[model samples]
Target: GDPPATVYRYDSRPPEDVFQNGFTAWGNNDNVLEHLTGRSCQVGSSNSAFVSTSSSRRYTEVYLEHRMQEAVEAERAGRGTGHFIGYIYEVRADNNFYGAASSYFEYVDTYGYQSDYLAHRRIPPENIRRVTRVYHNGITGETTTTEYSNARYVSQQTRANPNPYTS
Candidate 1:
């Protein structure tokens, strides 16, 4: 089996002035990813987060302008929505990279689920070798970026050996 690969979990907490809903676009609260990664998640537009992937040049040059545009529109409607978009790139080149985008609903439960969906499911040990989050603000249109170190365990480890003495 392959050794544990480095996973980057990126996230964003809303600024002080924003509303409180456990998201950067909502309000200032301790980012959940921060607890998992020991570092804050990067809060910014899709483009800025792509720029932050300096480790691999070709792998880094991707775009999320479309998603950002959608978020901007949502904000204009006073819907209080946000977006998360990112790409997973190969270590050496951009050839093996693929990306995805998801939008949060206007409510906290849905928003929380939105964050959890990415933070946990899309980023598991097998499907993803690394995890990084990019947060795009719908209100101010500001952006920030950060790298994460650790990955959180959502459920019981499958690899944990079954009780040998059982039955």
Candidate 2:
């Protein structure tokens, strides 16, 4: 059976509008059924995160590849559209913070899902120190973070989870 189609709303806004606002989820799913055959698919979604502005600052990027794969499988199995929605927020060094939200819509009887990466908003390097990379697995609903020392934005692995993506 396939997973049921679900609609996720965040901050009282529709999923499509979220991507138009900036947040982006980037990745590709290798297993999906397209044109009556198994094939690889590029999946994208709307998403957002935050980074602290001090030494040992933490930052996170939401990955959608795994979840998109799950959705595709579910759709193929005749469950339903595997639509998804998510939101994330973090505190900054100055006790102030910014965050973003995003969503992923499943395409059934169509050619995979549709999502676009409209360039992630960039932050000034000097405003941050060491960064902690965070990855949230939407399918499993697991959250993880890896800390690293930043030298002019280049990350040097320090300690903790090593799967973090450095900005």
Candidate 3:
């Protein structure tokens, strides 16, 4: 009825640029004061830089919003807790490498469908792109990036009908 609550797609790429700041699949890293302004970015702890593909990034913020609604539905259905969602944002900033500037942002949401007894999480937002602008300083100098779907990440998709040989 609602596009199969269990069916979800995982992002093929993970955050590579920002990896040490403690930015998990739920929120952004507020430790680093670096300002990133552009498309695509790495997200993580302030100690490491994680690099990730632009379009391959997932947006978990949206995923959480969706799951919150699902939770309400489950309560109505007497299905326990419905679910919980988790996501990670990857971002990068230009470091003036060899007089060149480069930066980007990426994200992927891992949704969790949990109950009082069991919980299951998956990446539901297929081809997620960052739609919101994030501020690193926690005061000013914010950055914006774009997240895309897997189809957008890959130039093309090769598929087989029913079998590998079938067209």
Candidate 4:
């Protein structure tokens, strides 16, 4: 297996831009290849949580402008529907890379069918690396982005290997 690829996010804009624009629009998956290798190259979109490759440059950008406004209004009315969490992933394949944003929520929920804005970008196995998490701050009226780690994990089957039985 290949080692983890270097993870990165498009930081062309500030936190304020993220808040105001809803999401950042960068070049498509092919643009990522071009940016990394310093050459003109193209790759088709792949899928993990979302799809990556696109026919147009704006294909992968998830805009939440109107949605944010609705959330704000709900907040002012003291409606329990203003909270949201947005995320972006930089999908990778060995050296190749693309971007993906998880579904945008109008409101977080404990249960029930909540509406979501799903922006797709394809991600390969072992390379669904997180780019950033975005959210609004009531005080500053600004959005923030938090970088994510590309760490892997394993599940331990408790019943398959009982500690007391082994002991």
Candidate 5:
């Protein structure tokens, strides 16, 4: 029997690294590009830098190990995350730190399901880091950098998550 569309409405996610968003998240291309690549990376012709709700040095973490494992297999099958603008922006000659995987989520079996978060766990990396920031360029020469103390910047999760546009 097929269920209603809304029942499974929340069943799957787009893996777009959309956890944070424009004006709601932290950091920006001005600061991140400078810090990550030590260069200027202007994202749009309108001088937008494509700033929005993106990842930063600190932010909330989501679980996705199974998804990432799924992604590794999937990528082997021709799929993957991360910025699609690298070649265009030349941000990282090598790239701004990819591979943020092993993030896993727990699923509680309801009614007659298994119950535990231990399965979706791991000895994660050195960072459990999370916080909204108002990143600055520090240089007075750049066209930007004055922290109102918050902005949306790109995150490494771009490579960890699944998306058609990331890589």
Candidate 6:
């Protein structure tokens, strides 16, 4: 755990509810993107996110451009709640995947099942070490971001755990 508290938050953006969807594009949001993700964003489009390792960089970077447009479209309609992201960052970099064909969506499962899917099931790149802790003070319009470690929890379901040996 180098320091679980590695965050790149979008402090300048509007509110979380707006991203009910997420907004898109970063021309000035580039600068807005600066203060935190600072070095990049405004400078140019690395044209992607999660660039530390590119083994799956092909798959992951493709998603970055996707969310960028998603965010951009939000401003066009009404602040693009669904498109604009970069508000917070954690790890299992693969964990931050944008729901693209999220356009299409899902099939079936119990609650805890998907929770298991979201928490565990992934390739080798998934590393759950030190994420961060964040707190927001509503009235003050301020945020609290501290280096934090993640414990197993967040997504939950009431059905059951895992079972196997099905043909």
Q: Pick by TM-score: which candidate is best?
A: 4
Q: Which candidate gets the maximum lDDT versus the true structure?
A: 4
lDDT of 6: 0.29
lDDT of 5 by residue, 7-117 (tens): 000102121222232111112322222222324222222222212112221111121223334544654566543101100000110112222211111111221101100
Candidate achieving higher TM-score, 2 or 5: 2
- Candidate 4: clashing residue pairs, number: 11
lDDT of each structure? 0.29, 0.27, 0.25, 0.34, 0.19, 0.29
| RMSD list, candidates in order | 15.5, 17.7, 18.7, 18.7, 20.4, 16.5
lDDT of the structure predicted as candidate 3: 0.25
lDDT of 3 by residue, 63-104 (tens): 444555566567668884443323344222111111001111
Q: How close is candidate 4 to the true structure, as a TM-score?
A: 0.34
Better of 2 and 5 by lDDT: 2
- Model 2, span 59-88: residue lDDT tens: 113233344456657766878455443332
Point out the worst 10-residue segment of candidate 6 by lDDT.
Answer: 111-120
- Segments in model 1 whose C-alpha atoms lie over 4 Å from true places: 1-63, 82-124, 149-167
Q: In what order do the candidates fall by TM-score, top score first?
A: 4, 1, 6, 3, 2, 5
lDDT of 1 by residue, 1-167 (tens): 32112222222222221121211222232233232232333343111112112232222333444555666677677774655554332121122111211212222234351111212112222322233345565555665544332232223322211111011
Question: Candidate 1 — which pairs collide?
Answer: 8-131, 10-133, 11-41, 13-24, 14-24, 19-26, 19-27, 43-144, 44-143, 44-144
Clashing pairs in 2: 2-79, 46-102
Off by over 4 Å in 6: 1-55, 79-83, 87-167
How does model 1 fare in lDDT? 0.29
Q: What would you estimate as the lDDT of candidate 2? A: 0.27
lDDT of 6 at 142: 51
Superposed model 3: Cα runs more than 4 Å off: 1-59, 82-85, 93-167
Total residue pair clashes for candidate 3: 35
